[PDB]
Write a protein that binds this ligand. Structure first.
Ligand SMILES: [Cl-]
Lengths: 527, 536
């Protein structure tokens, strides 16, 4: 009898399995697929980086920390990954060249860490190898036919006629989660406001967008577009360029390429090949067409329908529906892996407590559910606001600086809690982060929520037709200029600064500016 | 319509894909799997390294040359690969510690290149990406339902209802070859003498064998066992240890582990799990048991029925049955990839000429079939001779030095042709290698065939019970000491030298020894000065 059976051998499953196996619990991993296998969720963000470090140090699994830095990934996982110096955004309209005043860039500051483009076949192989090394058992090419709970534990039945007996079940799989299907956990219809279907593949011979735009020198970004994740924004959709070869002597010549389309505004074209439908969108935008001219697909194309789903319950007695099994919004802002790390941090210690005491009263896991549903709802608002804003750059510009400002604040809030636990060898300061009033919010301060609440109200009003994008942009631009908290030294309070470039000098001035600030939160976090 | 449709997205199909696509031909790759995917054939040899460079240089595909060197594989493919400094051999008997006087090592000389342990998932992905970049079209998860030939070309029918029209078909897949099935090309029963079934996986936490034997200091090998492919030899079978992490700061912690068993001596155990049957053999050999003590499988185990298969013919009107779709012997001595490289070299230019003339007369590809069948037959004896010899170390000792000696002579032969073609810029010298009387024989020299023809006759006689292994070993050990060609400075003519260690100084003397040698072949291939050796 296993302590925990985990469905899903992805990062979500194998990071948890590693944690539980290292602390001496008996784990079984089940997955219908076999490593090596392709996976999406390739771009990283500061919050993923710091919470990966938090989980690694808190639970004593060094392999998880090797994902928290571009340098450690190359050194420990594989050479086959790309760098992420920045988030890049470029507006396009049908037939037109991109207006060089309708771009945004957020260079990631060194304080949160060196972000990467994850070649997921290698990162997911790496963490599975670690999970098996720590003592996890594994069955790959394993189809779950039935999941049956009782007072003693759970019996998983496989297609091959085998059964796995355990005390607890975690479903860390995706959309086709057996637990979600078999217990009827999915919300139908979904509560989520964001709508987007997807077409994606891996390509060879993708050029840098830098080399295919005619940008006046003074409007070129501080660091190259190709050194980060490029976002090609248009009416109710966007395209990602995530290169793996964007650094000197890079071994992996592939580039991850996909398009998110609101299926309400871009209806299905089943007369077209996934490839043909993808290229029909490329042909709308001259600069994107020029970037992808030589590019050739090295995979069978994936074409989805509406990608978004939610669940009504995510915990029960002796089971947890984790992260990607519970819900999904969109690739935009690589929220998925941040959400996965937040849940693993929250679930791991509680589940180990429950196993030690042999008490599976669902009350102990009440916060895990609250965090899960909160993460999804805030993620929903962020992406829905953004898709709405894509119709009018001046409105997007507000969404951009409200979203990106939180990276540095929310980032240092976690780093502070971790350094206090590091220096004092006491896990009270990391545990203190859970004592926050807005579960799921990436910068859970009162002034930020109020600010983001207004952004959501106006965006949702634009979407309903109660306000115009011009009026909403007008109001949010006033609020930004009236703001006192938006890291002025970096230019987040300045709508005319499109390329936020955090230098060494500027972060010093942020610290000085923060020292004598009237808001307690700004002093606590940034001084 | 495509010029060529290639069935198989492994190195065999994608290396050929790259060559044809690079020369401006319209190519389609069809495979039932999708990259990334696991594959075997992980260890490399001198002949593979040198012929990879010949192919790359001859056909102008630089990516193929990046497989020909450990350093170039890490730099261009991925960091996920291991080094191969030597072939290691260690004899084991049930319940007993390994006898340190019953080991063999062959350190691979610098001249033939730096060998690797290929993590094939990254190796096969790399070349597939190259093929597509060169302009190959590909369909993955493509199941071939039907193949039919007319006078104008060939039609391939997919299970999804689609069809692919081409002028020529190459089947570069494996055992379940759609082309061999369609035309009933497989020999039943197979003509092959070698018998072996297999259990294999990838494991994490495999220790070095060096750290789990108490070998006397004077009998320890010049270079570590773990820096190469270790062969745990036993009665009518052997186990491979192929670590991907056998070098400083290596990223890939996996080690490839598998066992070959003569299915006539070890009958199937369907009452056991593949894992259980594998561990039942590990537990026979205390030293192996200590090596794998902490090792855990990271894949679903493979267990085979009997791996050897052969074809009655391998070329026809507008089709070729290529390397692994034609036949297979054994993982032993990593002959699989050498055979693939040899066929690609022979077929590529012949196929492109035929396409350009629009003439597919089977007489054009006569040498491709002769080479295909020859590679397999010689591969068959080498492994069968080795499997017979595993019963008695003194007999194996003669198989080892006859095999490993040819790997330096035959290697230098191709390398001479290669460096001469680069100097003159003239392909003549590389094509001249096809002008040998023994197609498929890795060292195609009169004296070497006679030596190997005897080793085979004796080995096959031991197997048939007409001679004892002791009697066979005695006759062969005489021939070795009567020999005048077995690279004395390296110790190939010395049965009491088990660990061959080709160093800079020893290779200088081979050159001097070769100068004014009574045999012309020895002079032509090995003869040089200590001035020309400086370069290296
Ligand atoms: Cl799924």
């Amino acid at each position: 009898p296993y302590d925990v059976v985990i469905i899903g051998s992805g990062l979500s499953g194998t990071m948890l399995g590693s944690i539980l196996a290292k602390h001496g619990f008996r784990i079984m991993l089940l997955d219908g697929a076999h490593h090596p296998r392709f996976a999406v969720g390739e771009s990283t963000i500061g919050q993923t980086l710091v919470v990966l470090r938090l989980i690694s140090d808190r639970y004593g699994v060094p392999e998880i920390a090797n994902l928290a830095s571009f340098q450690d990934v190359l050194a420990n996982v594989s050479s086959s990954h790309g760098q992420k110096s920045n988030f890049g955004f470029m507006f396009h309209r049908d037939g037109e060249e991109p207006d060089p005043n309708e771009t945004s860039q957020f260079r990631i500051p060194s304080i949160v860490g060196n972000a990467a483009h994850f070649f997921r076949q290698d990162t997911d192989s790496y963490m599975f190898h670690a999970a098996v090394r720590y003592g996890c058992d594994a069955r790959q090419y394993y189809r779950v036919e039935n999941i049956e709970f009782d007072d003693g534990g759970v019996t998983v039945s496989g297609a091959d006629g085998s059964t796995v007996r355990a005390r607890y079940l975690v479903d860390a799989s995706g959309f086709r989660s057996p637990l979600a299907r078999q217990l009827g956990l999915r919300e139908e219809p979904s509560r989520l406001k964001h709508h987007a279907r997807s077409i994606f593949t891996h390509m060879v011979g993708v050029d840098a967008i830098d080399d295919h735009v005619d940008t006046p020198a003074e409007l070129r970004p501080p660091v190259p577009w190709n050194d980060g994740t490029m976002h090609h924004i248009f009416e109710r959709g966007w395209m990602w360029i995530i290169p793996f070869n964007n650094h000197p002597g890079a071994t992996n010549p592939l580039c991850s390429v996909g398009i998110q389309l609101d299926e309400r505004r871009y209806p299905a074209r089943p007369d077209l090949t996934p490839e043909e439908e993808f290229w029909s969108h490329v042909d709308r935008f001259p600069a994107v067409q020029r970037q992808l001219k030589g590019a050739r697909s090295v995979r069978e194309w994936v074409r989805t329908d509406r990608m978004q789903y939610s669940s009504s319950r995510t915990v029960g007695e002796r089971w947890c529906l984790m992260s990607h099994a519970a819900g999904f919004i969109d690739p935009l802002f690589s929220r998925g892996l941040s959400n996965t790390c937040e849940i693993i941090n929250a679930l791991s210690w509680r589940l180990m407590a429950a196993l030690r005491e042999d008490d599976f009263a669902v009350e102990r896991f009440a916060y895990v559910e609250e965090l899960e549903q909160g993460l999804l709802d805030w993620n929903d608002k962020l992406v829905n606001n953004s898709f709405i804003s894509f119709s009018h750059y001046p409105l997007w510009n507000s969404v951009f600086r409200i979203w990106a400002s939180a990276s540095v604040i929310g980032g240092k809030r976690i780093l502070n809690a971790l350094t206090r636990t590091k220096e004092t060898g006491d896990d009270s300061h990391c545990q203190a982060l859970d004592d926050n009033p807005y579960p799921g919010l990436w910068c859970p301060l009162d002034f930020y929520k109020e600010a983001f609440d207004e952004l959501t109200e106006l965006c949702e009003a634009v979407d309903a037709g109660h306000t115009t994008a011009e009026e909403a942009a007008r109001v949010l631009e006033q609020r930004v200029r009236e703001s006192d908290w938006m890291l002025p030294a970096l230019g987040f309070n300045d709508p005319d600064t499109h390329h936020i470039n955090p230098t060494a000098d500027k972060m010093i001035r942020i610290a000085e500016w923060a020292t004598g600030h009237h808001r307690p939160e700004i002093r606590e976090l940034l001084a």
